[PDB]
Amino acid sequence: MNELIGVIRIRGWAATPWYIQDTLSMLRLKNAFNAMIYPKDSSIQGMLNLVSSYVTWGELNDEGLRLLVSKLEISRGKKVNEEYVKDKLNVDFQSFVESIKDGKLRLNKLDEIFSLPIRLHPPKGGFKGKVSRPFRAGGEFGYRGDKINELIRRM
Amino acid sequence: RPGRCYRKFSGPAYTRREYIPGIPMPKITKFVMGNVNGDYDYELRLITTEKGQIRHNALEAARVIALKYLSKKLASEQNFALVVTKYPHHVIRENKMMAFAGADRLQDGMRLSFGKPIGTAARLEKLGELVMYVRVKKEHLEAAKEALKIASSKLPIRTKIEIS
Amino acid sequence: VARSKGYRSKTRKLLEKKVREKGAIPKLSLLMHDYSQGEYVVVKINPSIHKGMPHRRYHGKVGLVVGKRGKAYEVKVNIGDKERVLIVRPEHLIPFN
RNA sequence: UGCCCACCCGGUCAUAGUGAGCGGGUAACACCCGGACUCGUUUCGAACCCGGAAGUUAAGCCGCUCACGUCAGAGGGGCCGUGGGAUCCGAGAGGGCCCGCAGCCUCUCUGAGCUGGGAUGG
RNA sequence: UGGGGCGGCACUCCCGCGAAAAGAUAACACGGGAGCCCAAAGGUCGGCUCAGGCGGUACAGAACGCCGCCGUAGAGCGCAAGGGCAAAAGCCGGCCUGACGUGACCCUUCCAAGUACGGGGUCACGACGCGAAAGCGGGGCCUAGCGAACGCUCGUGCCCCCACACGUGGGGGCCGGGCAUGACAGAAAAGUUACCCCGGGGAUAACAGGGUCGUCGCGGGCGAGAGCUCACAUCGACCCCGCGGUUUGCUACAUCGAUGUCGGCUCUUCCCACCCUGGAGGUGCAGCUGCCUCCAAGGGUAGGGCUGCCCGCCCGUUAAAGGGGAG
RNA sequence: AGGCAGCUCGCGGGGUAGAGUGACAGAUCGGGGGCUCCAGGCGCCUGGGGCUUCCGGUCUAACUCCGAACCCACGAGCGCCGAAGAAGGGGGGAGUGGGUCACUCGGCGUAAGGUUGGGUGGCAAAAGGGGAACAACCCAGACCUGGGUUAAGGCCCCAAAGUCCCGGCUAAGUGCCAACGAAAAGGCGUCUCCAGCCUUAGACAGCGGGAAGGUGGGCCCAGCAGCAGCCAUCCUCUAAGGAGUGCGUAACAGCUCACCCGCCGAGGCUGGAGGCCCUAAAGAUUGGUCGGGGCUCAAGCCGGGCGCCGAGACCCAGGAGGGGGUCUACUGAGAUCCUCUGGUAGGGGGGCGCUGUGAUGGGGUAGAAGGUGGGUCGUGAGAUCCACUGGACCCGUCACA
RNA sequence: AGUGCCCGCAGCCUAGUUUCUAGGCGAGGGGCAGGGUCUGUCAGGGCCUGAAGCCACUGAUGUGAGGCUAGAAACCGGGCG
RNA sequence: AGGGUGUGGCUCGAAAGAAGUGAACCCUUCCGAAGGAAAGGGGCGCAAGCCCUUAGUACGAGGAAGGGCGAUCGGGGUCACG
């Protein structure tokens, strides 16, 4: 159990039950191939259990986190007056970490607090890399331990 | 009416006599045969496999066939005892109205199609429940094997035997 | 077959009381404490007492003390997206938490 | 001193109960004395009501022991569910499996009255 | 309304079950009730505690009474059910009439999310009644026992009655009560039309597909029994498990601006659960005649009488005079 | 300036699944003990009748001493939307009251592409890919063009990619089928796995002998001389034998059965379960299959695995439009930023055409109008143009009808 | 009858503008009020009251007129067979 | 069956469209989105292949420059096959 957790959605947004369709919406997972980071807690645990059959989640590593963040683009940015700017440097931080953060003026120091929705890329070589059905428990949908880190590294 | 008509479950149980008038008398009347309290050694029982309901009509026939096979074997009071476990607590109901009223332009069809009591069944709810069993000594288990097995030939559901 | 909308309809065990507490009203200790505005209460109908019996539709819920009239209290409860007031004698009220 | 020991006023409403055995009272509590007046018995001072108060721990009360009832703890045994998912098995009935939860009965052993407010007794 | 009619009321309100531990939740689902009754079966106060069982006493008795012991409801509480109830809501006495007038808020009716009644709850003002009192009493221990407009009638203190005022009579209004509508959220209401007609309806009947298989035919399992002995040569009782969609039962998915309805005639084809013809076998097969199993659909499988048929009965031959499909 | 479609924590509610019946209400099977009455037989015994107690078992939609998962209330917390795009209040205009199916938990009914309920999902109004075609099955929500990567599925050919790998099994074309297509039984037919019993102190099987006798004891029985109807049973005995199994026989006799020896040197035997396969297993609609082709150390199945193809889902690039946050214009035109992008009933925003009226910098006409064909503009609605034909009247702009 | 309390938007003022719910003013608005009226014997209960509508064009919808279009058996009057 | 669609073949092309102030067609150089190789090397796995390297390199949808060539293309009709 570590604080830094993440999730990737692989299912679409049709045929999505009323229970869950808004949850990912409440989890800002509007549509598949998206991610963000959360502080782990029992309160978060409920959603992942309830949305397990639609997503994949687990504990990040340093390698994944650095790779994950490096993707924020012209329309994939922090809540910096909306605009989803392309981070691309501390420059966007340097002029805009002075709003909610304190002391985080280094690109490396984003290991604590919050983020926004990010638009992912398809997993390389097929999400069905060794699997064929996306619906095996313990292998496909839900919690995958550290292995989520390599799974996102493929992304 | 064929035995396939009531094999599965169609709805809840049906038990309260005071709420369900006019139950036809079950065929089975005697449930224990042989010298109970007699000394027995082999302790073989009978086990079912899948769920369902068993009509008493077959059971009573199963009761008779078991007795004759044992009765001819050694005796009826000899070192053996047959006891059937279950009782026909469950009651079946059938819309017989399509027989009488089904040919005179009366309220035919599914109209008022609640069932009517014509038979009873011994309900099965657990996987592998006792149905009958027989107690013998060491020297007659071989005759007891088919003795249960021949009875099982008439039961609607697949059955299992054991030795104890 | 539509069911009658009797004020106690479909209550075969809703008003059944565990045998360990039958008889006349035991819990005098609960009643004696008094409520004021803003208090939060839980409704638990006593089937024994025939006075001021709240309808079953609002049983086992969270209530708010908004005032007092006579020997009884009135209680605000949200059921759907509306508001309602239940004027009840205190002998079906237990403090929350 | 003290505090608990009963009592009156209680809360908890059986783990606090019931039944039997035994122990404790010169205070407290009853038993117990007697009814003219109060009141009262579709007869009775039985009971109630009043006036009392010798005796007395046998009742009750109280404590303890043992039984059963009863709450739990553990053990043994009995019995067995349900949410979440799959172009999984099975024709179906049904069942396994991965994700979350259990409880149910019955025997054995072990405990089993707590507590607020005031006038006696130590 | 599982076409319509007949059937019944599931058409008014209530209990449980249905109904799946919030609420709501269908059935021409099941088991049932009401269109009242009570001046005491109502209010209060007071007193006693039931059904049942045990022991002893004349008549005396299982059960009339009486004296003791046990009895956690197993009685009783008006009416169906459910629930609730033991110094009581039960039983017995005392006094009473709150089963109160007026004006309120609220619950159910009627979830969430509109609303007539009815029932019920909580009140204030006033006076009552009970008890010493606290207090309890606007009916029945709680959940069924009920009716809008309009018009009529009743009680109520006034109000109004005219193009001038006034007088008397007579009218009109309020506010509440009664007079009803059970098809019970309220028209005043009998049958046939096969002489029918009209606009429609596959939201829907009849023939004809599809689904299904209670029935029907067939199959298999098992085997009480009969056969001289011997269950399985042949017959197989009680039961059990399967198939076909040949009739017959339901289904209303398709067809109502038409898919023209029984039989029969002719004519074609199919299928095999084989009637015969071919092959093989068993037999309680001396041979013939038998009886039965299996394979085998190539071919054949008539002619008459009665009946419109189908079915059915029968005539005389033949190898027999198989049975079904193809809208 | 809070709001709440989710979750967590805290704090409450519950009688359903289940379970129990000595905890009520009922249902229901037996035995034991005692008491009581009757019938029979010789005070006793037997059978039957009633009562009690003890012990055991079988069920409950209208039974519940108990009782989950679970669902719900409220507070707090998390999380999300919010002054770019706003809890509440008011107002204009509707259609909608016949649903269906799939999955899942019911009821009715056996059943049903039946009906009637709870929840979810499509579809209706949802294209695109697979399932052969397809309303509903799975993937997945189509501003457009283009590039790339991927999903559900599939990968011998039709047809894009694997005649891809390991191990094992199937002989029927069983099969090559998610939504769909065979029961009980029989099979040592085959392929793997649990028990139990004998085995080098010689296992099973196999091959010859001893395989026996008083005695064929026998009872009734002509004789049953095991085996006509009931049945016992000793040593001559030992590396071996029964007073003895099935054939038998009128009765025998006899052949065998049971046991040891001689060879024999590998397992053998009996209950158990499973996979695949065979019978069970029969319909024609007219004609033969898994889609076919066709496939048998598989192009099948099982255990697994490895690598790829595959859409409009996702990424990117370019263009477009809506909505929302700066400039000019006698009233529409520009710049910039964010963002949104299936579609009936319905509502709303804006735009072209036809004919007439007023005007109108205005204009156009014997070379108009119209027709035919063809360029060019515009998403389109349409506009607009060139050759010819025609032979006398016709447009642009604004506003209006 | 038409007023009196309070929260509080935009804007304004104040100094910081630290960049500003920091505070006042606070239209509008909201909540408690109050008042007029009938009714109730008081609480109450019903209604009205915080100063803006009218007119004209176009538009939409309801209602009544044939009433988007078309579609019947019917009945009646008066004539003609 | 028909239509749109790709490749072509053959046909009409006066103007109205491009175009000699350069169409169409060839090269050469450059930039480069996401995405994304291979031979060789070494190792591992029975195998089927993967792992680091070669490398986000060659490559690439799109866009820029130069050159050489020299007049039809765009467009209409039909037909072949996908």
Swiss-Prot record, chain A:
GO terms for cellular component: cytosolic large ribosomal subunit
SUPFAM superfamilies: Ribosomal protein L30p/L7e
Keyword Glycosyltransferase: no
GO molecular function list: RNA binding; structural constituent of ribosome
UniProt KW keywords: Ribonucleoprotein, Ribosomal protein
Biological processes annotated in GO: maturation of LSU-rRNA from tricistronic rRNA transcript (SSU-rRNA, 5.8S rRNA, LSU-rRNA); translation
Subunit structure of this chain's protein: Part of the 50S ribosomal subunit.
Family per similarity comment: Belongs to the universal ribosomal protein uL30 family.
Name of this protein: Large ribosomal subunit protein uL30
Species whose genome carries this gene: Sulfolobus acidocaldarius (strain ATCC 33909 / DSM 639 / JCM 8929 / NBRC 15157 / NCIMB 11770)
Lineage, opening ranks: Archaea, Thermoproteota, Thermoprotei, Sulfolobales, Sulfolobaceae
Swiss-Prot record, chain B:
InterPro entries given in the database record: Ribosomal_uL16 (IPR047873), Ribosomal_uL16_arc (IPR022981), Ribosomal_uL16_CS_euk_arc (IPR018255), Ribosomal_uL16_dom (IPR016180), Ribosomal_uL16_euk_arch (IPR001197), Ribosomal_uL16_sf (IPR036920)
Keywords: Ribonucleoprotein, Ribosomal protein
Domain of life: Archaea
Pfam family, one: Ribosomal_L16
Biological processes per GO annotation: translation
Record-linked Gene3D superfamilies: Ribosomal protein L10e/L16 (3.90.1170.10)
Gene Ontology annotations for the cellular component aspect, listed alphabetically: ribonucleoprotein complex; ribosome
GO MF annotation terms: structural constituent of ribosome
Family according to the record: Belongs to the universal ribosomal protein uL16 family.
Record PANTHER family: 60S RIBOSOMAL PROTEIN L10 (PTHR11726)
NCBIfam families (UniProt xref): PRK04199.1-1, PRK04199.1-4
Name recorded for this polypeptide: Large ribosomal subunit protein uL16
Phylogenetic lineage: Archaea, Thermoproteota, Thermoprotei, Sulfolobales, Sulfolobaceae
Gene name per UniProt: rpl10e
Curated annotation (Swiss-Prot), chain C:
InterPro entries: Ribosomal_eL21 (IPR001147), Ribosomal_eL21_arc (IPR022856), Ribosomal_eL21_CS (IPR018259), Ribosomal_eL21_sf (IPR036948), Translation_prot_SH3-like_sf (IPR008991)
Any one GO biological process: translation
Organism placement in taxonomy: Archaea, Thermoproteota, Thermoprotei, Sulfolobales, Sulfolobaceae
SUPFAM superfamilies recorded: Translation proteins SH3-like domain
Protein name: Large ribosomal subunit protein eL21
GO molecular function, one term: structural constituent of ribosome
Signal sequence, start to end: none
Organism: Sulfolobus acidocaldarius (strain ATCC 33909 / DSM 639 / JCM 8929 / NBRC 15157 / NCIMB 11770)
Gene name of this polypeptide: rpl21e
Family membership noted in the UniProt record: Belongs to the eukaryotic ribosomal protein eL21 family.
Gene3D superfamilies reported in the protein's UniProt record: Ribosomal protein L21
HAMAP family: Ribosomal_eL21
Assigned keywords, A-Z: Ribonucleoprotein, Ribosomal protein
GO cellular component: ribonucleoprotein complex; ribosome
